Copies of this chain bind each other. A is one copy, B any other.
Amino acid sequence: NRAQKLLHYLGHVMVNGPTTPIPVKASPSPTDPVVPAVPIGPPPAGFRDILLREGPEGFARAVRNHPGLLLMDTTFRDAHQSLLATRVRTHDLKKIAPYVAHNFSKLFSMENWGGATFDVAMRFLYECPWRRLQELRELIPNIPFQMLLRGANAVGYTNYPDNVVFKFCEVAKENGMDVFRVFDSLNYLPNMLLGMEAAGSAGGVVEAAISYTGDVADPSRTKYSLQYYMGLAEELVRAGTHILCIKDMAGLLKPTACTMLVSSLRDRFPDLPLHIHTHDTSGAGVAAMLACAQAGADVVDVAADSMSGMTSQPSMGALVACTRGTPLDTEVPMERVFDYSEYWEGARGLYAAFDCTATMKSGNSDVYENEIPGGQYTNLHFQAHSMGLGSKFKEVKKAYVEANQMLGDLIKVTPSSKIVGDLAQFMVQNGLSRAEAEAQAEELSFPRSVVEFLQGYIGVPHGGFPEPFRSKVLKDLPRVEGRPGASLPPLDLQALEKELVDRHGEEVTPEDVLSAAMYPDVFAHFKDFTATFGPLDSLNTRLFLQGPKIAEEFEVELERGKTLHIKALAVSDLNRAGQRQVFFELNGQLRSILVKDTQAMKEMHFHPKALKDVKGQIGAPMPGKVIDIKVVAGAKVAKGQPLCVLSAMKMETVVTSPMEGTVRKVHVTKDMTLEGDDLILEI
């Protein structure tokens, strides 16, 4: 009963379309991604060998004592979150993972988990994220792995109790995660210290990421000054971080600001490794990374050349070529870069339904005025499409700016940007301005994320909440102040394990109860879907998003040894219950799949009958047209008296009543062409 669920999925996708929401109506390309040649044998030695040999402090001293620029690949997580709405599957990553393991041994790390990959992998792709992590950990053994962990937000959207995040880092380090980049939205310091403690006690390398916004080189803006970042970095180094990081999530770091900030961090902490992360939204990413690498940055984040650009990271080939021959040489050969970007061009062609290039064709300097991050940009375009706002995204960006100013000049990264984007979609859908919605603040019903933020369930912003808005929206809802994670009670995780073993099965693991603690309803619907259709992980992307075509024999190997040569021969028409039939040739023998179509129902309405059991139910003895009614609705009549007269083709009849009674209502109007045995009078 394994190929039957797969054929049910394939027929359901053929007849009804894909169960994924599709924002751009397009098909996957017929061209396959070209995987290059990989030398057979064990891969080279990398930085994970020195990590497992001498710990995180020796890893930090090795990355600090490396002559030249080090790179981190973000193609597996942040490139397709910025460009393809986080929709790239584990199949296309596993096809290129041995090439990366053989040829990119000199990388610092590789971000391939965390962010929005958790929620999208369970929600839209029907995959387990721990399964992707384990598969790529077997495939790439020589390069350290890196995950993007929020403060007390783990991989969710709100603050969690401490035991859940500690257990989350414990199990993620158990599965294979090496480097943990911990950041917070509002730069709220105890949430950062909590996330750093949870990441450090699990045994992993800690990368304390400071969220950057504004401009430190512009003295006109004084809220997030250079001294603010210097004090934040001083306290984060005082908590025992191993690598400091600057997360510029919108792409706002300019070369002068880069030189100023990295030189301040280098002459304040002379032996601490600096990592810079930026997006190339404004079009100045490679220039900013060259400014950082000359100012004293150690690791910078890149992506493959076909998977970089618009809202993504800077390009790997441009960073390799722009440092060739310099003292900052990365000594990576450019031909391996060419083959890797060749693969990702072929693989990006498969995801044309979620692609950024259907709307945005080049960069945009207006990110200097709306400050939207890139992953949020593509996921926000999808979310605005799925709520009817799919043709008003410029107004969503304008209300984005308005909602940033209205909520008190927040630092927008994931959670806070999700709050500002929810408020922007609310202000677009209800036509409200800034002052127009602050005047009606005590009347309107803001969404759960905005009201939950104004309560303070994610933390406290810099300079405090907007207190007139917080007084007008929150009437008497509880304002839990201080730290949200030090107030909420710990979830009994063995109770949740006991709650989940009696619903799905007995292969429920701690990874599953962490998936259900982070997302209860998404894990429930994911488990129901994978009960119905089974492991759709090992399908290719054209098969997953499009199904097969007629008379084209395709090969599916679900598990080890179990191979299936499947043809799709015909699709019938609809049955009595609105169901179609699909005909397959599975392993050479004919099989049949019955799938419910989803559009051919809910089309019926007509006039009711005249029920014969009651003599006071006067109906039409013959069809035609009501030409005159002789009764007043409310009086009573005798039997034999005329009530209504009807006419048909050369025929006219007068309706008589069979007995007495009070005329309740005249059910028929004037000149209503009714059928036979249809009710004209209730009596």
Binding site for B on A (CB under 8 A): 21, 217-218, 254-256, 282-284, 286-287, 290, 305-310, 314-318, 320-322, 324-326, 334, 337-338, 341, 345, 348, 355, 357, 361-366, 368-369, 383, 386-388, 422, 425-426, 429-430, 443-449, 451, 475-476, 621-624, 640, 648-656, 658, 675-676
- CB pair A284 B286 closer than 8 Å: yes
- CB pair A305 B361 closer than 8 Å: no
- CB pair B338 A366 closer than 8 Å: yes
Known contacts A286-B286, A621-B429, A658-B443, A338 near B365 by CB under 8 Å: yes
Nearest residue (CB) in B for A326 is: B256
- CB pair B254 A321 closer than 8 Å: yes
A-B contact pairs, 15 of them (CB 8 A): A282-B317, A305-B363, A305-B364, A309-B309, A309-B362, A315-B363, A317-B366, A321-B368, A348-B361, A388-B675, A422-B651, A445-B655, A448-B653, A449-B651, A475-B640
With beta carbons under 8 angstroms apart, the residue of B283, B430, B451 that contacts A305 is: B283
Known contacts A321-B368, A388-B623, A622-B447, A362 near B284 by CB under 8 Å: no
CB contacts (< 8 Å) of A284 on chain B: these are 286, 318, 321-322
Distance in Å: Cβ of A125 to nearest Cβ of chain B? 15
Contacts A21-B649, A425-B651 supplied; 8 other A-B pairs, CB < 8 Å:
A284-B321, A286-B286, A309-B362, A317-B366, A334-B365, A426-B621, A443-B658, A475-B640
Total copies of this chain within the assembly: 3
Distance in Å: Cβ of A479 to nearest Cβ of chain B? 15
Distance in Å: Cβ of A609 to nearest Cβ of chain B? 14
- CB pair B217 A426 closer than 8 Å: no
CB contacts (< 8 Å) of A623 on chain B: these are 387-388
Task: Sort A-B residue pairs by CB-CB distance and give the 10 closest, nearest first.
Answer: A317-B365, A283-B318, A287-B287, A283-B315, A386-B649, A309-B362, A475-B640, A284-B318, A447-B653, A448-B652
With beta carbons under 8 angstroms apart, the residue of B310, B341, B387, B622 that contacts A622 is: B387
CB contacts (< 8 Å) of A363 on chain B: these are 305, 308-309, 315, 317-318
With beta carbons under 8 angstroms apart, the residue of B307, B446, B640, B652 that contacts A362 is: B307
- CB pair B306 A622 closer than 8 Å: no
Distance in Å: Cβ of A320 to nearest Cβ of chain B? 8
Known contacts A255-B290, A283-B318, A365 near B337 by CB under 8 Å: yes
CB contacts (< 8 Å) of A675 on chain B: these are 388
- CB pair A364 B387 closer than 8 Å: no
Distance in Å: Cβ of A655 to nearest Cβ of chain B? 5
Known contacts A286-B283, A318-B283, A318-B284, A254 near B365 by CB under 8 Å: no
With beta carbons under 8 angstroms apart, the residue of B290, B310, B320, B446 that contacts A287 is: B290
CB contacts (< 8 Å) of A446 on chain B: these are 653
- CB pair A357 B365 closer than 8 Å: no
Q: Which of A345, A361, A640, A658 is packed against the most chain B CB atoms within 10 Å?
A: A361
- CB pair B422 A322 closer than 8 Å: no
